[PDB]
Design a protein around this ligand. Structure first.
Ligand SMILES: Nc1ncnc2c1ncn2[C@@H]1O[C@H](COP(=O)(O)OP(=O)(O)OP(=O)(O)O)[C@@H](O)[C@H]1O
Ligand SMILES: Nc1ncnc2c1ncn2[C@@H]1O[C@H](COP(=O)(O)OP(=O)(O)O)[C@@H](O)[C@H]1O
Ligand SMILES: [Mg+2]
Ligand SMILES: [Mg+2]
Ligand SMILES: [Mg+2]
Lengths: 381, 380
């Protein structure tokens, strides 16, 4: 039903109480929605901003029941929720996002198929389930190549880059531990992402293309506008609309891409949720990805996605938090977001800072001059 | 000097929509929130970590808020002297009590404005009938008699157009201490929100043009449709006030702008203000984000207007229309405060209409037909 509207005043239920849910919840609260959250850990980032907290396991098909009960619409922010858990909600509650898109994007192999069905380029890949299949995959794809677990991967965990035969021993260890795909290395010039939003009624908006810098396989910086040709942007944007189409998107889709020196774009992966590379939108766009996500599922008119000022988002990990607090008096032109996580771990995402400036290169220099991310800048040398 | 770091608790006296919007901005930066409000489940309580339900004059509850808070601020302005002194001395209330004291009495306020070197309409204290008589004689017609305290949304005011109005005026002067002000023939009402941090850093937001109907704000238009010179004058005036009054926190400066290019300061609000809600969607930092930074002594954000805007207030009488017209809200950024009970003239929310062209934004508000009542009252 493409006409159903969840009006301000109603309750939005969110599965997963991480920072993405917290930010959804804050954007929803501005519009006067109530918020219920289910998370296995008490006092999660999202519970700190929610009206109702359900502390329970993600597979607990009774707590989930209770979430459905108290909510007028349900969404997820946790991308590794059991797809069969969602299936109950779309059957017996209101989950306009569906379970289909999630199941496709959760598995790298099935994800590759969806992208190829849509007609867009991917790195050439093979499924790997044992050593014989790894051996054949390497023989067919050669070097350089990258082995990735088909499920559960994040921050490059469950990945091995095969530069030469010397890396095969490490690849074999991983291939034994989990189902994987081997895919060709893409010698891209830049990584970019595009966040596309589509409402229950089919209205579609796309955010500006962000140029992403990863360090140790964790997002470090998002740069908007991406320093790429107008031609690449229109292509990146067209690619995202196509994906929203073929996947019948309702809600948010983050599309990560590789841009090669000849202006070709390879789709790296999809996330059916607000994405770290869209955090810049909170301070630099007319609508944030979180505001958009809420409007999409509630079937409100979408907001505009104009870039109102250039921006560099910098991630704040556990290893940075001390530096941030010490350097707080130097954060002029910097828009701090901290997620309320009670325990820092070195590489855990604790917050982000959006650095706004008319000139993108001055924003970049600001990040450097703060010295908070010396570890990242040293690794990028 | 002192800095209140993310992770600490900000305590707010007053749980209405201004407290709620302060709490939402604070949460983005990782602050905890405690609130005191006389009614359970207030707009701010819905976003707060800790809720204390009590009267604003209950010193024990005020003390309990303070003792669990690393910094205390307020949306409710009428805190009495004994509570204010306690807070200033035993809690951390960087805004202090001096500015608040000056802004709570219209005569004290106009005095402080003039002492700061700024223009206001000619005015006289009115404490009895004989002073009203002399004041009417001095200022002539037209003039406006207002109560010095308690006054908000217009009530406790008599416009004196002729001798025929003296009667209702004597009646008001009978009930309350008043001021008589000379009528300012103004073209526009405008306001400027100015921010000054604990350490003295200042930022000033763009001039807004304010349209009141029944003395409740209806619309704020930004940029105000005034000359570059009036605009520049208004901004300079607000800066002088912030400096002279040693502002810490937020100060809304409401002004009258004449066709002749004059500015008179009308009144001050030492808090985020309804005429600054446009900043949530149209500026680089909202008045709420700025307020938090100011009192916590963080570097202030920029106040650049990033897109022209018309803010329209949503009263109890409007909420039905807003919900019915939801699918027509393209380019309109809705804010609703979570108030449990509606009332006809109660502020339930606001909508920020963004557009490269101010007149298109204004036309959008009209075309929605939600505010027909306001538009007709403006017509006549
Ligand atoms: N085929 C490839 N060629 C070149 N670089 C690659 C390739 N695959 C991955 N990378 C690099 O490794 C980074 C992480 O890869 P990927 O996004 O597949 O891992 P992830 O664990 O899924 O990350 P996330 O935290 O976004 O979920 C990429 O952003 C890219 O820089
Ligand atoms: N001196 C004056 N000259 C002309 N108009 C005035 C004057 N004082 C008040 N008004 C009109 O009355 C309205 C309300 O006065 P104000 O002092 O703002 O009361 P309140 O504190 O209730 O808002 C103003 O918006 C303006 O239209
Ligand atoms: Mg995926
Ligand atoms: Mg990735
Ligand atoms: Mg007024």
């Amino acid at each position: 039903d493409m006409t159903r509207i969840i009006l301000p005043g109603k309750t939005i239920g969110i599965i997963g109480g991480g920072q993405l849910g917290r930010m959804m919840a804050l954007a929803a609260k501005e519009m006067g929605y109530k918020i219920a959250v289910l998370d296995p850990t008490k006092n999660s980032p999202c519970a700190q901003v929610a009206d109702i907290e359900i502390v329970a396991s993600y597979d607990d098909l009774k707590a989930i029941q209770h979430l459905a009960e108290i909510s007028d619409v349900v969404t997820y922010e946790f991308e590794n929720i059991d797809y069969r858990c969602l299936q109950w909600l779309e059957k017996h509650a209101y989950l306009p996002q569906g379970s289909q898109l999630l199941s496709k994007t959760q598995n790298r192999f099935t994800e590759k198929n969806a992208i190829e069905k849509a007609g867009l380029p991917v790195a050439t890949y093979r499924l790997v389930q044992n050593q014989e299949q790894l051996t054949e995959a390497i023989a067919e794809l050669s070097y350089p190549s990258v082995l990735k677990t088909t499920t559960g991967g994040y921050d490059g965990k469950g990945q091995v880059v095969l530069r030469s035969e010397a890396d095969v021993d490490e690849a074999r260890k991983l291939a034994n531990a989990a189902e994987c795909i081997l895919e060709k290395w893409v010698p891209f010039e830049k990584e970019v992402s595009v966040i596309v939003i589509r409402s229950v009624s089919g209205e579609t908006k796309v955010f500006p293309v962000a140029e992403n810098i990863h360090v140790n396989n964790i997002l470090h910086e998002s740069i908007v506008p991406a320093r790429i040709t107008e031609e690449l942007s229109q292509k990146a944007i067209a690619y995202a609309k196509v994906l929203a189409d073929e996947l019948e998107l309702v809600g948010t889709l983050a599309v990560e891409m590789f841009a090669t020196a000849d202006g070709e774009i390879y789709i790296n992966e999809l996330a059916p949720r607000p994405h770290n590379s869209g955090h810049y939108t909170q301070d630099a766009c007319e609508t944030s990805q979180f505001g958009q996500h809420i409007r999409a599922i509630c079937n409100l008119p979408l907001g505009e996605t104009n870039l109102l000022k250039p921006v560099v988002m910098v991630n704040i990990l556990g290893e940075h938090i001390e530096g941030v607090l010490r350097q707080v008096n130097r954060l002029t032109g910097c828009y701090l977001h901290l997620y309320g996580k009670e325990e820092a771990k070195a590489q855990r995402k604790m917050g982000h800072v959006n650095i706004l400036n008319d000139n993108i290169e001055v924003a970049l220099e600001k990040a450097k001059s703060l010295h908070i991310w010396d570890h990242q800048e040293q690794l990028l040398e």
